[PDB]
Amino acid sequence: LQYGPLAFVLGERTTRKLTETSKVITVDGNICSGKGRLAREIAEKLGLRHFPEAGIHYADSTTGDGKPLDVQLSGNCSLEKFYDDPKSNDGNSYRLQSWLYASRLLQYADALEHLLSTGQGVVLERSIYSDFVFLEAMYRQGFIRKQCVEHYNEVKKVTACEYLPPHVVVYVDVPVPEIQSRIQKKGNPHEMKITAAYLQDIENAYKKTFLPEMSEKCEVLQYSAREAEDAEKVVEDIEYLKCDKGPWPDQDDRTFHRLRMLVQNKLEVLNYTTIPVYLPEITIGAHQSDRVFQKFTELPGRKYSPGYNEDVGDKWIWLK
């Protein structure tokens, strides 16, 4: 049965499934730092579900088949051309930033739904609470306008206030010259054009806004580059945290019921991402919108509801 008021009335309660290891974990860090490996190790050791960082096609992997769609029908933005031409007059930069924030919101909703449904913990790379640093690094470099920042702040204000911040925030600190050396050793021709000022802006945003404001909600575990490979020590540092200061201890059955109703129904999660604020970077004309929607509806498993597409092998349609 679908979770709802009826399930809550008889039986189902979230508070009982929490078994001292729920602990939503996020592992933040600068570009090219090894935060993903640390998050994978934390998830493996503690037995929590690992969520890889949400990209342009995160929503594609959770709907239909998990395969990504064409960039025209999903995202409509490019990271590679953001690196190539960050000051392009077609609005690619803020479009990419807004789409990435929406993807992060969807991933956070998925992780919260899983945790509240099963009681198992989750480990995320970045979150909606951390995305803004990139936006700041975009604004200080002149890549986006101030109106874009205002729109981003409005959307974040109406979206991020409805969820619970993570239990423990893990940060990996890597100096900018080391990051440049790692990027050069990587070999991707699009990341070599990242100027050091952009990385320094990301680091400044992190260390001056995110960590100070996150430390008030819960204690923050910072690790340098050398003491992050030893994942067992990080895990046993996590295991001895006194987590009784944030909003998580101030949660009972009814608040959990409201949150669980919110985390499912992804349309209600994404409601305020498409607010009618007409920025040229993200506003799409009627003709292009109609053409792109017609193109999307013609994908092999997208015309009808999931179980009603006989062109991908759905049977017994006329009894469903």
Partner 1 sequence: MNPIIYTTLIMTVMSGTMLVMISSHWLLIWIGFEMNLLAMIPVLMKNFNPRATEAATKYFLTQATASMMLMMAIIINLLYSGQWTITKMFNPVAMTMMTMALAMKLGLSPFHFWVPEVTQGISLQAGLLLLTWQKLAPLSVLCQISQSINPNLMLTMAMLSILIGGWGGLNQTQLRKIMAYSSIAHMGWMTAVLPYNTTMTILNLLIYITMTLAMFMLLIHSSATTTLSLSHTWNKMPVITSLMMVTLLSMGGLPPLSGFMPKWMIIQEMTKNESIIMPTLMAMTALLNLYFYMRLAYSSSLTMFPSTNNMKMKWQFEHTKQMKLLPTMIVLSTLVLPMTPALSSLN
Partner 2 sequence: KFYIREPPHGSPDWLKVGLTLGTSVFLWIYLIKQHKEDVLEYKRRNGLE
Partner 3 sequence: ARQWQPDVEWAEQFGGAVMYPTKETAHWKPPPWNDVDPPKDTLV
Ligand X SMILES: Nc1ncnc2c1ncn2[C@@H]1O[C@H](COP(=O)(O)OP(=O)(O)O)[C@@H](O)[C@H]1O
Helix axes 253-263, 92-118, angle to 10 degrees: 130
Is the CB of 111 or the CB of 214 nearer to partner 2? 111
- List 44, 239, 268, 310, residue binding partner 1 (CB under 8 A): 268
Q: Please, are residues 196 and 31 in contact by the beta-carbon 8 Å criterion?
A: no
Q: Please, are residues 47 and 29 in contact by the beta-carbon 8 Å criterion?
A: no
* 157 phi and psi angles, rounded to 5 deg: -60, -40
147 binds, among partner 3, ligand X, partner 2, none (CB under 5 to 8 A by kind): none
Could you give the CA distance from residue 201 to residue 181 in angstroms, rounded to a whole number? 18
CB of 99 to partner 1, least distance (A): 7
CB of 216 to partner 3, least distance (A): 18
Q: Does 204 show up as a binding residue in the annotation?
A: no
Instruction: State the DSSP code for 311.
Output: G
Is the CB of 182 or the CB of 303 nearer to ligand X? 182
Interface segment toward partner 2; rule CB under 8 A; list 55-63, 70-78, 213-221, 231-239: 55-63
- The enclosing H or E element of 92 equals helix 92-118
Q: Does 242 show up as a binding residue in the annotation?
A: no
Could you give the CA distance from residue 10 to residue 16 in angstroms, rounded to a whole number? 14
- List 283, 295, 307, 312, residue binding partner 3 (CB under 8 A): 283
Could you give the CA distance from residue 26 to residue 18 in angstroms, rounded to a whole number? 18
Residue stretches of the annotated binding site for GTP: 32-36, 83, 97, 104, 126, 131, 134, 138, 186, 191
User: What are the residues binding partner 2 (CB under 8 A)?
Assistant: 61-66, 301, 306-307, 312-316, 319-320
Residue stretches of the annotated binding site: 30, 32-36, 53, 83, 97, 104, 125-126, 131, 134, 138, 186, 191
